[PDB]
Amino acid sequence: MIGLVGKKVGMTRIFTEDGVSIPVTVIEVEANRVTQVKDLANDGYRAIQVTTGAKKANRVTKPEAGHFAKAGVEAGRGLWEFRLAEGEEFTVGQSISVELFADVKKVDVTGTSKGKGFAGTVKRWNFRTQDATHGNSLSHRVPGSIGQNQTPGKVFKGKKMAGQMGNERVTVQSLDVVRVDAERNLLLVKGAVPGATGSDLIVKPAVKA
Amino acid sequence: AVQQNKPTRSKRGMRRSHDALTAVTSLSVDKTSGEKHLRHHITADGYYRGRKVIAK
Amino acid sequence: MIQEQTMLNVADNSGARRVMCIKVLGGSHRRYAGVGDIIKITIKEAIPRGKVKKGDVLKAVVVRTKKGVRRPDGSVIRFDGNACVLLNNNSEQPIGTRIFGPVTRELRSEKFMKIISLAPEVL
Amino acid sequence: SNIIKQLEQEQMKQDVPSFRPGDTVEVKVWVVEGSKKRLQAFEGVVIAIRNRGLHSAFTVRKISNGEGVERVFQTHSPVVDSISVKRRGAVRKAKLYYLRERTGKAARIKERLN
Amino acid sequence: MRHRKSGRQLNRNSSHRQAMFRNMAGSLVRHEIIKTTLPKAKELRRVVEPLITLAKTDSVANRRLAFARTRDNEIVAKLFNELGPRFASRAGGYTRILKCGFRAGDNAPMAYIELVDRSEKAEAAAE
Amino acid sequence: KVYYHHTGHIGGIKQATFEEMIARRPERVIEIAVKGMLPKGPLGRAMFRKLKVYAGNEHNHAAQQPQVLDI
RNA sequence: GAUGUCGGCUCAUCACAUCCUGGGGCUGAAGUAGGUCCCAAGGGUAUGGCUGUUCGCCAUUUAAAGUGGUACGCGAGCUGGGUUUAGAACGUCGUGAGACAGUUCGGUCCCUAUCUGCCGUGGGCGCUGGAGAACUGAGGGGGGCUGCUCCUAGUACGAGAGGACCGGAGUGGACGCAUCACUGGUGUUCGGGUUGUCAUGCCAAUGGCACUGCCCGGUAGCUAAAUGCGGAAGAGAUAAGUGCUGAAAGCAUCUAAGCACGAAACUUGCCCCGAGAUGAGUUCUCCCUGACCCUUUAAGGGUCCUGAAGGAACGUUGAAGACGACGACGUUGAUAGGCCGGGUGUGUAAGCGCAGCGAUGCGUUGAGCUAACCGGUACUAAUGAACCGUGAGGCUUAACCUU
RNA sequence: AAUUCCUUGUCGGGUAAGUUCCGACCUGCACGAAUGGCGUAAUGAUGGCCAGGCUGUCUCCACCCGAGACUCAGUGAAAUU
RNA sequence: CACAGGUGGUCAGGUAGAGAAUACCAAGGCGCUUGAGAGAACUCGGGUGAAGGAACUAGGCAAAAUGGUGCCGUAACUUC
RNA sequence: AGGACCGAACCGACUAAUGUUGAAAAAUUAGCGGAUGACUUGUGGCUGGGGGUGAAAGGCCAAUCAAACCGGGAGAUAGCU
RNA sequence: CCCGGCGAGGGGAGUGAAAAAGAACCUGAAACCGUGUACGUACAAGCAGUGGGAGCACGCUUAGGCGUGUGACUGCGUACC
């Protein structure tokens, strides 16, 4: 089964009747407008293109716009695709929304990664900053030696050094749906969603056995 | 650090070539004057959508 | 406690003044405690008619934290100082028969059955 | 969307009394516990302005007995039974600190008068 | 990082920002028309417009008020007496910034600040 | 036959039996069997790029009229 | 014409002869537990003291307190305590000067990274006409740890006390990720409190400056000390090991023909980067169907007409970030400052009425002032253009096109 | 011990400690009476040890600001080879 | 070197304060010439810190803390 | 009164931070001591290299000191590179 | 006579045998940095050289297998003192 493209929109500590509160993250589920349903008519290729949203979209390219034109005709925010199973989809007005999360106990959450500027040396990997007393030579913070010696004469691959985030994906994995709320159309998750607020996300039914 | 040998002249040219000054993508002149322009800024005599700038 | 060592306050009649955490329990490769954590304390003071003497090593549990301690809404009851009620060195429950000063409403658990079973309030 | 910062005003309760710092109050609450209902009340002085959307709370300092405690009781909590304003003093501050340790004539602060 | 912010810190400490902005906001109210750096012109725009707002109807209690935020005798005279009735007919956008071009002494990017209702000006140059 | 490599990570050699390599992604047993039969750098890359195996029994090469060869 | 040291910190890496869980044989092992014992480098692998300390002792955690190597890893990262090591001086010894691998006191540790690696990142090209959008998996990594008790399970077994593993489960700990509502932190684009002199002609009032003068609170952001949470059922290929069937040896026998089972490792399953995969990518969405002269010719040279879709500069600027790239977008306009409604801070401006000699408080007024957030508003500023991109786009076999 | 091959003496004591510190004792390195010895008030920017203060040195690091780095314009080295 | 290095004599203003400490300041001196923008690592300087209180290290390493004037009150040792 | 004391100006530099291809011939900023004394110190004067001069470090002698600078011996000599 | 900072520098017109002798003036290498042309560089790899060589410009190739300069690719291959 597919995913739901959300918006990170809301964070609430909400109360329950016994006087206990749950920190929660609040996602407005918008309905899917399907585009065409790409299927294995042509090649072996099988996937569904969906737009959950709209933009003011006065500068957009004709090649984005004709996807929205064959679609729910709403000058779209963007194109998200999902592989599919168990036969082709119906191509117009499907509107999968809150009904998906009525039986989903825990969801994965597949972000648009996390957008934290530089990250870099010491902060991203949570290392120590070298002693800030003892009059250390040009050093109140240093990461520590990254290889050994001539005996190998290299730096091994995958070592934690410098660099930016590069905005990949981020799966938080397995956080509980606390509630799903029809008519307001809000999905309350118990854990956190990747990125700052006003960013997009995938909130999808869990991937793992 | 320091260095091993005096380096080749092709090396010096590669290191400064990408840092070299980049194109203006042609230029502008005004819709509204016999004054020449600077693109998406206002001239010394204030012509773009009038008013005034640089009373120097 | 949060750093290695750390004195925080006696809160029962087993000792006097301050007592020192030497370690945290309930895991290892730890430096700092959570709110609900069980500490290993040494008595740095004692009182001669208390339950224990200077250099005794015992177990203990948190009864105040100056940052505050929390659970139900995430709301702290936030105190003027850190404090710890000493337990027995292997067989659990307090050794002291009295609590002195306020309490939390986080304290309703099996491990404080000496002091919350008294009659004035909060059983 | 358009919900952000509106949601602090939507959640926020309307039956909340008008205030300035040094107002005393009383909070009646449950003890909550694992399976059992008991009650209790709390009095003292409220040291600081609240109004915090959903998590908004009466922040009493007790100073009744023993060593000093601040207690935060949530306005928006379903177990909170009653909230009286009582006496209304002036302080002109976000914090009260010199009364932390004094509990003698400390939870009965005066009306402010002419 | 700096996500979900606005505005700018320029070139030095807060005592410097207050004293530079006090130099420049006093120069604007006498001359109507200035040229400065682009980042700097916005922050100058943002300091003076709300003062203009306060002074939009003539009023002694708001003149006592204005003297308390800005205890300067030039800024409070130009407000209320000359500039209240000038801007009485506007609700925001009391001044505009013009993106003027590059600086000749080095290359620095600039913007000009010009009162909204400033409207007779020469189009010749001076030396 | 366990196809030895050390691409850059983790204490140990890492490995795969010939059987995993033929049953799943089957090309590679024959691929790294001819690899070591070609010389050094430049000539050995130039000899290799003429070959294809694909996955197995899924070839697209009907239209050229391939000349059969038995080994 | 030099690889420059101990102990310690930081940061690691590789060998398994595994600290441990996990699978399993033997046992003078009843069962449990231990002894004996093979597989296995995947993952986690504690902390304060004294000493210059490798090594020592002690207090404590942990289910647990490992083994080996790295110019005695690592000063083109960090120390100047140690000894020789300049002085002093103890202890010792020699006519002495002066020594000691015994010793105490503080005492100069250098280099802006050329080429090389590593991780992040841009530009340029092949992608087969072009452009833009989504995207598949050749190929390589993350995770892989582990206490607790509940069930499993007081049961086989044993005289009786007692007495196990996988799977499920709630919960702790490490480790790794994301996060800012909660709780703390800060917040030189906000309020208030406060010492002082200087200033508005004076007073009431208020303010420049003294570390952002000090001190406390603080929106939005960011953040861990706070928050959520993976660590997986299964699959295949097995190892050690139990075998069946079966030869040396009419049987027996993990083996040789044959074939059931058999662990976290290994190939994965869950997660992430990925078409330079020249084998050059697919699929989706959009777009361009004027012309002549010649040679070098799956081509290039010249010229008129003439360039769409798209691109970038430029510009305000962002919920994106060293620089970029990425992104909203230039009146087709909410991009951003004001401004209007609202959030959330703070604590009722000054003036006026009034008590009081006043400091000051109190009604007027629940005051005033307010930053980043949200939604509006063209009020305001982003002149319009030009330019790069062009007229339907390979050879050759098979297939189809009147072929 | 400013001194001790062994040893971080031994024992008592503070303590998470205890080679260091402080008292006694000698199973005494190579201590030992002007390269002098025992002991002391005041003194030292002089040395070791103790309990409390306080504090971002640290547990464990977060956010803010400025000059370089980084952006643009100017000028423009060096160790080395 | 218009080098934050070094260097003798005299004269002697204000408010608050205990004075030539010390905040500001009259007269005067004078902006120690890259600038403007961002606000990455990191380098140096400056702010602030929950809870702890050197647990960092061979070693408390400024940075933090103590301090000033009036008063009450006051130890072993001592050459009083 | 004082080879007493807390302490500016006035002198130094035990430590800490920094500077470490410096703003400075160890200076700077901050803790620190001396500042009626065996102090601070202007002006003028004097000894000349294994020679002076030293309340002691084999200290200091034109940015410096376990041997200052220059003209001659001198192409010192090298069982040597 | 032209541009210009009241400037620098060069060209235009005129001198001379000669300024391809223009005043730092004799004729003028090599390092040095820059202009100008041909050909090459995105199956891409270490003494940068050697051995084989498509291609391409130029010489009318004297068209008679050639000269010149360069060169995809690729066997071989470790400096001098």
Q: Chain A within 8 Å of C73 (Cβ-Cβ)?
A: yes
For C101, the closest of D32, D66, D101 (CB atoms) is D66
Q: Which residues pair with D57 in a beta bridge?
A: D74
Query: What method was applied to determine this entry?
Result: cryo-EM
Domain that holds residue E91: 13-116
Q: Please, where are the H alpha helices in chain F?
A: 18-23, 28-34, 42-48
A24 in Cβ contact with A8 (< 8 Å): no
CA closest to E38 among chain B residues? B41
In angstroms, the separation between the Cα of residue E76 and the nearest Cα of chain B is 26
Asked if B51 lies within 8 A of E126 by C-beta distance, the reply is: no
Report the distance separating Cα E3 and Cα A114, nearest Å: 12
* E96 φ/ψ angles, rounded to the nearest 5 degrees: -125, 150
Classify domain C1-123 by CATH number: 2.40.150.20
Buried b (16+ CB within 10 A) or exposed e, E20-52: bbeebbbebbeeebbbbbbbbbbbbbebbeebb
F40 touches A: beta carbon within 8 Å: no
Q: CA–C1' distance A82–I26 (Å)?
A: 81
The two three-digit tokens of residue C48, written as one number: 């001669």
The C-alpha angle with vertex C94 and arms to C92 and C99, in degrees rounded to 5, equals 155
Task: Give the closest-approach CA distance of B14 to chain E in angstroms.
Answer: 26
Show residues of chain A in contact with F9, CB under 8 Å.
Answer: 156-158
Residue F68 CA from chain centroid, whole number: 21
Does the CB of A126 sit below 7 A from strand I? no
- Tell me if A10 and D3 make a contact (CB, 8 A cut-off): yes
Q: Between the CA of residue E84 and those of E58, E75, E76, E90, F45, what are the distances in Å?
A: 6, 12, 10, 10, 81
The answer to whether the CB of D30 falls within 8 A of the CB of D37 is yes
Question: Structure tokens of A29?
Answer: 């589920």
Report resolution (Å) to 1 decimal: 12.1
- Check the CA dihedral D11-D12-D14-D16 and report its sign: positive
Residue D6 amino acid letter: Q
CA angle E4, D2, A32 (to 5 degrees): 105
The Cα E7–Cα C118 span in angstroms is 60
DSSP, collapsed to helix, strand or coil, labels residue A176 as strand
Show the tokens assigned to D75: 């306005």
Query: Does the CA dihedral E78-E81-E82-E83 come out positive or negative?
Result: positive
Length of chain F: 71
How far, in Å, CA of C24 to CA of C12, rounded? Answer: 20
Q: Which nucleotide is nearest to E9 (CA to C1')?
A: G189
Q: Is A41 on the interface with D (CB under 8 A)?
A: no
Segments forming the whole domain that contains residue D12: 1-114
Cross-chain CB nearest to D100 (options C73, C80, C105): C80
Give every CB contact of residue C64 below 8 A, 6+ residues apart in sequence.
C9, C11, C79, C80, C81, C82, C83, C101, C102, D67
**Phi/psi of residue F6, nearest 5 degrees:** -145, 75
CB count within 10 Å of CB E66 equals 19
Sequence spans of domains, chain A: 1-209
H or E stretch at B9: helix B9-17
Put simply, the answer to whether D74 touches C101 (Cβ < 8 Å) is no
Read off the tokens for F56: 């197995």
Residue F24 CB burial class (10 angstroms; 0-12, 13-18, ≥19): exposed
- If you measure CA to CA, which chain C residue comes closest to D30? C105
**Which residues on neighbouring strands pair with residue B32, listed in sequence order?**
none
Residue E42 lies in a domain: yes
Burial label for C39, CB within 10 Å (0-12, 13-18, 19+), is: buried
Interatomic CA–C1' length for residue F46 and nucleotide G221, angstroms: 56
**Per CB distance under 8 Å, which residues of A are interface residues toward F?**
156-158
Write the CATH number for E18: 3.90.1030.10
For C78, the token pair is 């936030």
Distance between start and end Cα atoms, chain A: 14
Residues of chain E positioned with their CB less than 8 A from the CB of A196: 3-4
Between CA F45 and CA F27 the distance in angstroms is 18
Angle between helix E60-69 and E38-54 (nearest 10) = 150
* Interface probe with A: pick from C32, C73, C108, most Cβ of A within 10 Å: C73
Nearest 5 degrees, angle CA B50-CA B51-CA B56? Answer: 110
Cα–Cα distance list, E1 to A172, D4, E4, F13 (Å): 21, 21, 10, 40
Closest residue (CA to C1') to nucleotide G351 in the complex: E61
